[PDB]
Enzyme design. Structure first.
Site, PDB file in Angstrom:
ATOM      1  N   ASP A   1     -15.180 -29.289  19.522  1.00  0.00           N
ATOM      2  CA  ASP A   1     -15.718 -29.371  20.879  1.00  0.00           C
ATOM      3  C   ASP A   1     -15.472 -27.946  21.425  1.00  0.00           C
ATOM      4  OD1 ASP A   1     -16.572 -32.210  21.317  1.00  0.00           O
ATOM      5  OD2 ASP A   1     -14.465 -32.751  21.197  1.00  0.00           O
TER       6      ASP A   1
ATOM      7  N   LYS B   1     -18.838 -31.217  17.025  1.00  0.00           N
ATOM      8  CA  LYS B   1     -18.505 -31.834  18.280  1.00  0.00           C
ATOM      9  C   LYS B   1     -18.039 -33.256  17.960  1.00  0.00           C
ATOM     10  CE  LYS B   1     -20.056 -33.867  22.379  1.00  0.00           C
ATOM     11  NZ  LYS B   1     -20.686 -35.087  21.795  1.00  0.00           N
TER      12      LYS B   1
END
Ligand code: CLF
Ligand SMILES: [Ca+2]
Ligand SMILES: [Ca+2]
Ligand code: NA
Lengths: 476, 522, 145, 522
Positions: C129, C10
């Protein structure tokens, strides 16, 4: 025997999974000359079932390869990756007179050759730069067309804007054509998309121009791509009849002839399927009436010349009879020589959208019988014009599958087959004489009286060739 | 008009006076054609150095490319496996073109299917097309294997081949054990040869990736041979003949020679011969793997070296004398079999032919194009013959390949006037043969338009085409030829020298003008 | 020899910092490494190069006729401990598929000879992500094991 | 003058202006040349029917013959035996010519000796030449056999070969057991093929006449094959390949394939391969004997049937489809071996090629010449292709052969416009291609002058030459080709259709004139 054919159809269908079987059954039928509404017997112009080996092409083939490709003094860009333009480069024999690479460009392959970065960022800037390059290296081109390949619409490029901007900037006719291959279900939608593109970006250019001196005998040949010279051997007869052929759409056609077409008195339609669209539009917008004709074989040609002449005054009708009398001894000599060699032979055909029904008369003029015929992408109005031309109980097949065609041929056992390049070698191996009926097997023209002689010679050389008696080794 | 006993086809029919007058009227009355003197002026300008510079600075337009797209190569590769049906997931138009293209070169049937994805698949993908497609294909054409590749539409929208096939099986559209190797083959990346490489590595990984613990290098005592995109039947054949002649056990991975040459005996054979599924499964057990066209087998090489653990030999395509010698010596080294007297004699016969024809070949200048391996092999042999490869064009070539070719050229005085071009097309080549005129062009059928163009400038500027490569559509059965090994070198040498002698005979056929040199003996 | 690794994660949690310090440590102990940034933010090599922003392949490719017009030299930069650095970059905001932009860049490095036979490691710093088909392409295309 | 970096050979050197002015002055000042308009007038007259009639009534003059003399054939036959030296008893001039003739066709060494009889042997014969000759030859060139034939001088004066050789042995010039088969080969009787027949029967009788009581027909289980005068290496090769492919034991009697194709590896091999003496001795023990070119093996046939007792099959030369099928079936019948799948497939591939090219071949008209068997085989295949063999010329043919060819023609509608000519030469053929113009000529290199002559009348009257036959001196390595079997038929078919396509491309290469038919695909 109608029963035997219906039975053949059902037997062949047995190999299919349920979904494909029910669908294919609607595209196969036993002919009934009495029918006028073909839908009661066969359905067409539907998508092809996946994995069945349809013989069909795409919309790009129908637009770039068929309608636009032939316009000789324009440069047509196969917009997208390198594939499409390369496979279709000079594969169709749409003849023309010109200095290729200088004032004409038919046999060349112009392309934007999309690379991965063009897919990521889009190809509009590449298109704009390409156009400047075309203008610099081919200054005598009289217009540019942009034939979209599959990726154009999928990545959201705006070729219409580019064409408008560059068109105004260069004072040049630039036609964006959305003929991406995923549109439609075959070459057909490509025709329609192409006709609409001519209408919207080319045809009205001279709407306010009155410099063209017209005569009451001005006609245009609509829908003849001059395969092997077909249009020229058609044009000669019309003019010997006293008419003036202002344009040819699109075999050996120029952008100026197209722009001049709205000034003619009658549009003569040969290929109904590919150009009925623009024909209806010209009647609606310019009041120009259009009529269908057939120049395949002496019977149909004579009938067509007479029907066309009847649309004009008595002087044309008189010249029409003089032309018919001039050629009478020529085609009678062709019949005299070849009919006895082909009398009674049976033929099975499979072509695109016109010829499957248009050539029947020519075969009959040589005493031959068409026992089966079908189209790759014809619509029902095409089948409506077909059933009455075929004999009772003959076989009809729409978007036939490789498997189906092979099985029908094994049962029916025609003496000759007339189809395309993808079919040719299959049947020759089966010992069945085969003639290409798209490319005329590099022969032709086949249209008109001069074309009839060639057609006869060709059917004879192949059907009666000594090679067909040698497929079985004598120790077998 | 026609004379029934002497019917004329388009040529020369349209040369008749009435047709000629008709065409003149069509032009004058409705074509608004540029004046002939203007056409001559522009044509002349297109043969100049000034035009050539503008031509070479193109950055967006491509004219007359000398390459095709990926799936064409995936289909040819698939065609070389037993009872295997090439299947291209995507738009059907592509398949009509791939078949037609190969049909015209081989003059044979070419079977391949599509799953006809249309506009309604452009938004949500072609998963359903794949389910119905594989089911209909297996049922209708009964292949024992379906090799899947893709068209650009499927690539652009992101269809996941792996998942689509898994689901087709998971849901019962095709048996779970039915082999369905696959490969993504984007037309906007590389070219047709890249598609061959992608398809091959895909089939190789399908049959061996998950069972490598079962393999032992050298256990089957054979040498694998990967041919790459090959369109000359004699090339598959000469390799098998030389290996058998040496008593070397081998396995030709992707062998389409039988299916591209079935007999016309009364029946159509959709499938014939080919590499078997068992041969692919067993391939890792070979002593090694030899790649015949390494410049377009890079992905395959990584998989063969990295997973099969084969010490793939660094060999150039076996074309010409030196490279055929190297191939045989390496094969001899790997298998332990000596090179037999018959091959040694064949080599000496090619050398004899070279000594006999060297005087006519010496210094002859050539322009040539084609795929990377084929082009460099042609270049190497031309150098061996004492010829000068002036314009070397490989549209689908790359920088590393160009450096390798430049090295081959630097190793011979006959390579001094040569320039290697990558990314350039036949419109670029056309300028080169006008500005730095060679004696002949060695290329495929598209080269005929260049010859026509040079003749228009003048008979003395005409550059005749010698047809070697793909595709060759305007001559019959040249696909039966050979370009690899001593046999292929003999064929190419014969074709080159006789092309030279044919042209010389044409130029000295003028009665009392140039026939003083129309020698009976040459 | 050469191991192909991909660092996925992420954004906003120091992934790029950890990737560059991992690489600097490998170069420090004697390994040959190449860092290929595959984040649209193109901030996977600044610490190795002591720079504010490395020209990306996508940025330069958009300006050119063809990607081959680019020269490895402007794309690949040597930094600390000799580790080689490249930034794939992404297509303009809103238009392209960032994932396809990353594959285009890696394919370019492959053809250009950027993967020397010397290399011990190659580390792709990829955004994780939203794990869409686009950002998952380095996996689908066996770019990293 | 010369530009050092672009040196010009005769052509186009003499086209320079100074050379052109010089030649004009040489003509005007000292050649007393007929005016150009007079030359044009006579040339035109030579292309008319009136001239053709005068031409065909010749009875004493022969112009441009299409045949050679006997000993040439004897030498080629002898060359096919192991370590055998062809020896021609007579004048040496002949030998310099026989060697040179074959050297130019095969581009290889051709060994043969003469015993140089001169004027002082013209009165009393060449007995001494034979004694010293055989001794010097055996000692100097070390052959294991010397095959003797003769020049016309020795024939005219009546030298008795049998007696001369016997005396050479009786007096110790050569060992009594040294094999010296011989044959009288008068150049004024028949032609070179007759010399082959005479030499062969002479060698056959030498090794078997006196020991027939020891032979048993069929005891060795092989089939003898007699090739006749053959100048295509692929013909000896294809016959051996097909027989081996069938598992048929055989013996090729007179096999010069190795000696006419030695490798260039650093050493000159005067002798190589060949039928062994043992094979000739053992020949009567075969199951049968097949003659590949029966029309020039009549004397051999009488000896084989009458003395060896072999039921020589009535087979035509194995050229074309039907005749290759007949040859294989007969061989299968005699040996008991079935025709294998591979040959059946090869046959089907030839048929496939015929179906693929029939449209370009149909109705094409040809003029052709050569030896009898080769000519009739060519005629048969042309008919099978749907072509029309209009002018069939065989200078050395005979009445019985013509009847056979006329029967082959009557059996096909494609033979309706054909006329078979025997005893006529290439000057007669030249008239035929002007008065009844065919599309092409199929013949040897002498035909290039006829093509040149037809082009002079006009480009539209030009009849291009397709080179198949012997000798072929102006092209390189065509002697490596094959004209027999399915392989030979495939090669000839490819050559014929591509010759047609090459010419069509030439006629449609005119920019904006005839290029509307310059099709990429054919
Ligand atoms: S339906 Fe083109 S051949 Fe295809 S994979 Fe793309 S580059 Fe190659 Fe029609 S428009 Fe064209 S032909 Fe197909 S591609 Fe679509
Ligand atoms: Ca074929
Ligand atoms: Ca030689
Ligand atoms: Na200019």
């Amino acid at each position: 025997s109608r029963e035997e054919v219906e039975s053949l159809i059902q037997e062949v269908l047995e190999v299919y999974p349920e979904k494909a079987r029910k669908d294919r059954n609607k595209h196969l039928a036993v002919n009934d000359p009495a029918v006028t509404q073909s839908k009661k017997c066969i359905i067409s112009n539907k998508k092809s079932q996946p994995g069945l080996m349809t013989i069909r092409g795409c919309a790009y083939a129908g637009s770039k390869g068929v309608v636009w490709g032939p316009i000789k003094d324009m440069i047509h860009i196969s917009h997208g990756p390198v594939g499409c333009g390369q496979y279709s480069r000079a594969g169709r024999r749409n003849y023309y007179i010109g200095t290729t690479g200088v004032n004409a460009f038919v046999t060349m392959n112009f392309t934007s050759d999309f690379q991965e970065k063009d897919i990521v960022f889009g190809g509009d800037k590449k298109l704009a730069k390409l156009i400047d390059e075309v203008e610099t290296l081919f200054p005598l081109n009289k217009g540019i067309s942009v034939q979209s390949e599959c990726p154009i619409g999928l990545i959201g490029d705006d070729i219409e804007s580019v064409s408008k901007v560059k068109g105004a900037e260069l004072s040049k006719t630039i036609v964006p054509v959305r003929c991406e291959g995923f549109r439609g279900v075959s070459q057909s939608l490509g025709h329609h998309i192409a006709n609409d593109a001519v209408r919207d970006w080319v045809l009205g250019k001279r709407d306010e121009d009155t410099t063209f001196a017209s005569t009451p005998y001005d006609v245009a040949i609509i829908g003849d791509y001059n395969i092997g010279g077909d249009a020229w051997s058609s044009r000669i007869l019309l003019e010997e009849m006293g008419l003036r052929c202002v344009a040819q759409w699109s075999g050996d056609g120029s952008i100026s002839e197209i722009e001049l077409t709205p000034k003619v008195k009658l549009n003569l339609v040969h290929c109904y399927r590919s150009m009925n669209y623009i024909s209806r539009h010209m009647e609606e917008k310019y009041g120009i009436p259009w009529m269908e004709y057939n120049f395949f074989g002496p019977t149909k040609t004579i009938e067509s010349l007479r029907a066309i002449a009847a649309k004009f005054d008595e002087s044309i009708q008189k010249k029409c009879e003089e032309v018919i009398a001039k050629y009478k001894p020529e085609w009678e000599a062709v019949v005299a020589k070849y009919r006895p060699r082909l009398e009674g032979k049976r033929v099975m055909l499979y072509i695109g959208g016109l010829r499957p029904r248009h050539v029947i008369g020519a075969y009959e003029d040589l005493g031959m019988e068409v026992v089966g015929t079908g189209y790759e992408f014809a619509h029902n109005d095409d089948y409506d014009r077909t059933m009455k031309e075929m004999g009772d109980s003959t076989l009809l097949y729409d978007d036939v599958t490789g498997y189906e065609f092979e099985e029908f041929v094994k049962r029916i056992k025609p003496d000759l087959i007339g189809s395309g390049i993808k079919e040719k070698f299959i049947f020759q191996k089966m010992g069945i004489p085969f003639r290409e009926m798209h490319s005329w097997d590099y022969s032709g023209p086949y249209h008109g009286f001069d074309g009839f002689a060639i057609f006869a010679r060709d059917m004879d050389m192949t059907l009666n060739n000594p090679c067909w008696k040698k497929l079985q080794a004598p120790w077998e | 008009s026609q004379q029934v006993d002497k019917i004329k086809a388009s040529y020369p029919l349209f040369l008749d006076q009435d047709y000629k007058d008709m065409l003149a009227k069509k032009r004058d009355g409705f074509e608004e054609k540029y004046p002939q003197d203007k056409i001559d002026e522009v044509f002349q300008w297109t043969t100049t150095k000034e035009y050539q510079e503008l031509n070479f600075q193109r950055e967006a337009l491509t004219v007359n490319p000398a390459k095709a797209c990926q799936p064409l190569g995936a289909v040819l590769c698939a065609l070389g496996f037993e009872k295997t049906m090439p299947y291209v997931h995507g738009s059907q138009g592509c398949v009509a073109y791939f078949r037609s293209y190969f049909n015209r070169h081989f003059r044979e049937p070419v079977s391949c299917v599509s799953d006809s994805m249309t506009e309604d698949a452009a938004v949500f993908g072609g998963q359903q097309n794949m389910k119905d497609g594989l089911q209909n294909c297996k049922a209708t054409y009964k292949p024992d294997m379906i090799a899947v590749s893709t068209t650009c539409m499927a690539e652009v929208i992101g269809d996941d081949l792996n998942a689509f096939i898994n689901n087709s099986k998971k849901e019962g559209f095709i048996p779970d054990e039915f082999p369905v190797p696959f490969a993504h083959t984007p037309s906007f990346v590389g070219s047709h040869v890249t598609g061959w490489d992608n398809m091959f590595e895909g089939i190789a990984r399908y049959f061996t990736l998950k069972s490598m613990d079962d393999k032992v290098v050298g256990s089957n005592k054979k040498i694998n041979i990967v041919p790459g995109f090959e369109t000359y039947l004699g090339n598959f054949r000469v390799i098998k003949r030389m290996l058998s002649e040496m008593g070397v056990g081998y396995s030709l991975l992707s062998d389409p020679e039988e299916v591209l040459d079935t007999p016309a005996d009364g029946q159509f054979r959709m499938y014939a011969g080919g590499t078997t599924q068992e041969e692919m499964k067993d391939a890792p057990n070979a002593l090694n793997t030899v790649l015949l066209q390494p410049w377009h087998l890079e992905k395959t090489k990584k998989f063969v070296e990295g997973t099969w653990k084969h010490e793939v030999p660094k060999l150039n395509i076996p074309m010409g004398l030196d490279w055929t010698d190297e191939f045989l010596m390496k094969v001899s080294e790997i298998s332990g079999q000596p090179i037999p007297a018959s091959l040694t004699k064949e080599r000496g016969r090619l050398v004899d032919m070279m000594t006999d024809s060297h005087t006519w070949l010496h210094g002859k200048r050539f322009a040539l194009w084609g795929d990377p391996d084929f082009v460099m092999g042609l270049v190497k042999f031309l150098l061996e013959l004492g010829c000068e490869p002036v314009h070397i064009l490989c549209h689908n070539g790359n920088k590393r390949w160009k450096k390798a070719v430049d090295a081959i050229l630097a190793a011979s005085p006959y390579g001094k006037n040569a320039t290697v071009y990558i990314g350039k097309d036949l419109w670029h080549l056309r300028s080169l043969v006008f500005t730095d005129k060679p004696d002949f062009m060695i290329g495929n059928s598209y080269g005929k338009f260049i010859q026509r163009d040079t003749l228009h400038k003048g008979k003395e500027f005409e550059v005749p085409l010698i047809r070697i490569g793909f595709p060759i559509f305007d001559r019959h059965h040249l696909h039966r030829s050979t370009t690899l090994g001593y046999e292929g070198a003999m064929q190419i040498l014969t074709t080159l020298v006789n092309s030279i002698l044919e042209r010389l005979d044409e130029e000295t056929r003028g009665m009392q003008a140039t026939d003083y040199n129309h020698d009976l003996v040459r | 020899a050469m191991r192909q690794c991909a660092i996925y994660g992420k954004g906003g949690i120091g992934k790029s910092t950890t990737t560059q310090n991992l690489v600097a440590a490998l170069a420090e102990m004697g390994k040959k490494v190449m860092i290929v940034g595959c984040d649209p933010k193109a901030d996977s090599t600044r610490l190795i190069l002591h720079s504010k922003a490395q020209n990306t392949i996508m940025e330069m490719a958009a300006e050119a006729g063809t990607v081959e017009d680019l020269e490895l030299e402007d794309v690949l930069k040597a930094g600390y401990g000799g580790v080689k650095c490249v930034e794939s970059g992404g297509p303009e905001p809103g238009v392209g598929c960032a994932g396809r932009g990353v594959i285009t860049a890696i394919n370019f490095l492959e053809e250009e000879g950027a993967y020397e036979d010397d290399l011990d490691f190659v580390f792709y710093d990829v955004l994780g992500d939203v794990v869409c088909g686009g950002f998952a392409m380095p996996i689908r295309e066996n770019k990293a094991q």
